[PDB]
Write a protein that binds this ligand. Structure first.
Ligand SMILES: *[C@@H]1O[C@H](CO)[C@@H](O[C@@H]2O[C@H](CO)[C@@H](O)[C@H](O)[C@H]2NC(C)=O)[C@H](O)[C@H]1NC(C)=O
Ligand SMILES: *[C@@H]1O[C@H](CO)[C@@H](O)[C@H](O)[C@H]1NC(C)=O
Ligand SMILES: *[C@@H]1O[C@H](CO)[C@@H](O)[C@H](O)[C@H]1NC(C)=O
Ligand SMILES: *[C@@H]1O[C@H](CO)[C@@H](O)[C@H](O)[C@H]1NC(C)=O
Ligand SMILES: *[C@@H]1O[C@H](CO)[C@@H](O)[C@H](O)[C@H]1NC(C)=O
Ligand SMILES: *[C@@H]1O[C@H](CO)[C@@H](O)[C@H](O)[C@H]1NC(C)=O
Ligand SMILES: *[C@@H]1O[C@H](CO)[C@@H](O)[C@H](O)[C@H]1NC(C)=O
Lengths: 276, 49, 49
């Protein structure tokens, strides 16, 4: 239990360009066929996104600093990504929260956690069975816990390009993790494809704690015990910046396109004219 | 006395007939009584939100 | 108040126009989007010889 895996290949901190993706709906207010300018945190266009790879050559579960909300993208086909852990220090002293799809359900536990320094799910190959994984060795002083509806969680291995793109925005506004989600079914070979997405909100979680750190949650696909194998997996981490944005809303009240004012002088003009 | 012509004088008004009054269905009773009647009150340094 | 026919996302609760005025509201008890319309204003003028 609580295994730590040796000689993991370093991620090397490979960087890539961001794109028009990373946009989410600012509020529940419905506006249709209208051009609106708003200040908020967003992912800047063409910014650098850090690609962390768990393909199998490298495994990385590094403690990633949670700065002013993060844009996460997971490009995967076997649903290898399971969840995340968000906490200030995660040294069993401070409050931390765990949001995952562990076996069949969405579980969110805000409890003081003996964070295994290498937390990994254990999924059986050719058996499609999750061997019990110690995400937390123990729990104590558990403040907030929410179990969502059970669902069929696909854990089998599929060979190919990463067929799926799960994208999330985590904003720690006041004491609330605001998560805005979306998915894209396009499969990309090895790059975070260029495009825009509009992220609908899911949970306004009232955690009420400071989050300075976070670590995504991966799973094992070891064909043999103690071998610690993993399948092809890749994901992208981007930080958010307080820059104003220019959003176009169709008649359907859905975000169709946006412009970053600060990016380009012509974009600045587009904002000042409030025209595209 | 007024000579011939058109003259704007007033502003027409339609008054509301009644009220719709729609709120959610929450009926649970709030624990503000419990908070106020809390048997022990923490210190000002340990003031709790 | 009339029914509102604009498409509405479930998280979207208040529907608002260009001026960010609620032209559409979701009833709490019946999540029916409702078109909101102004009340019949105008000017009173007098024709006279
Ligand atoms: C808003 O969404 C609706 C529903 O998805 C779209 O209405 C569809 O329009 C296409 C093309 O006219 C038709 O083939 C479908 O039958 C319509 N479905 C429904 C349920 O109305 C509408 O076109 C969208 N408006 C946009 C994107 O501006
Ligand atoms: C993004 O990365 C490029 C090269 O990797 C670098 O020149 C640029 O300064 C970076 N931009 C940042 C870190 O904002
Ligand atoms: C758990 O946290 C407590 C204090 O909150 C600490 O004393 C203990 O050492 C922690 N557990 C481990 C395994 O370090
Ligand atoms: C997943 O979480 C739920 C809710 O806490 C729990 O009942 C279930 O046993 C967990 N499954 C695994 C494999 O950890
Ligand atoms: C909160 O955790 C501390 C130890 O970190 C413990 O002493 C305390 O009893 C816990 N509070 C509750 C309500 O369990
Ligand atoms: C997080 O915020 C709290 C409250 O402002 C503060 O006490 C703490 O130093 C911050 N950092 C960490 C790592 O908890
Ligand atoms: C609220 O309660 C009324 C009275 O029973 C009921 O008609 C209505 O459907 C309820 N709506 C919701 C959203 O609970």
């Amino acid at each position: 239990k609580c295994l730590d895996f040796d000689d993991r290949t370093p991620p090397a901190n490979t960087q890539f360009l961001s794109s028009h993706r990373g946009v989410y709906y600012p509020d529940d207010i419905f506006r249709s066929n209208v051009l609106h300018l708003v200040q908020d945190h967003f992912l800047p266009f063409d910014s650098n996104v850090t690609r962390f790879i768990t393909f199998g050559l490298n495994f990385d579960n590094p403690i990633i600093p949670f700065k002013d909300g993060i844009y996460f993208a997971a490009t995967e086909k076997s649903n290898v990504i399971r969840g995340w852990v968000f906490g200030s220090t995660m040294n069993n002293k401070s409050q931390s929260v765990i949001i995952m799809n562990n076996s069949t359900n969405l579980v969110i536990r805000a409890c003081n956690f003996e964070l295994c320094d290498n937390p990994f799910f254990v999924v059986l190959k050719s058996n499609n069975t999750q061997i019990p994984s110690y995400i937390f060795n123990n729990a104590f002083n558990c403040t907030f816990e929410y179990v969502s509806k059970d669902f069929n969680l696909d854990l089998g291995e599929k060979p190919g390009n990463f067929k799926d793109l799960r994208e999330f925005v985590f904003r720690n506004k006041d004491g609330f993790l605001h998560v805005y989600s979306g998915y894209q079914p396009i499969s990309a070979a090895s790059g975070l494809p260029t495009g825009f997405n509009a992220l609908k909100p899911i949970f306004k979680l009232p955690l009420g704690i400071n989050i300075t750190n976070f670590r995504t949650l991966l799973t094992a696909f070891p064909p043999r015990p103690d071998y610690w194998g993993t399948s092809a997996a890749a994901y992208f981490v981007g930080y958010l910046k307080p820059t104003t944005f220019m959003l176009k809303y169709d008649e359907n009240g859905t975000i169709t396109d946006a412009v970053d004012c600060s990016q380009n002088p012509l974009a600045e003009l587009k904002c000042s004219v409030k025209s595209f | 006395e007024i000579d011939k012509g058109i003259y704007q004088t007033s502003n027409f008004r339609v008054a509301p007939s009644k009220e719709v009054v729609r709120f959610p269905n929450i009926t649970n009773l709030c624990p503000f009584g419990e908070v106020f009647n809390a048997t022990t009150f923490p210190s000002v340094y340990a003031w709790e939100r | 108040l009339t029914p509102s026919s604009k498409r509405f996302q479930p998280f979207q609760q208040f529907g608002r126009d260009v001026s960010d005025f609620t032209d559409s509201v979701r009833d709490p008890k019946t999540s029916e989007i409702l078109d909101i319309s102004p009340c019949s204003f105008g000017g009173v003028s007098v024709i006279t010889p």
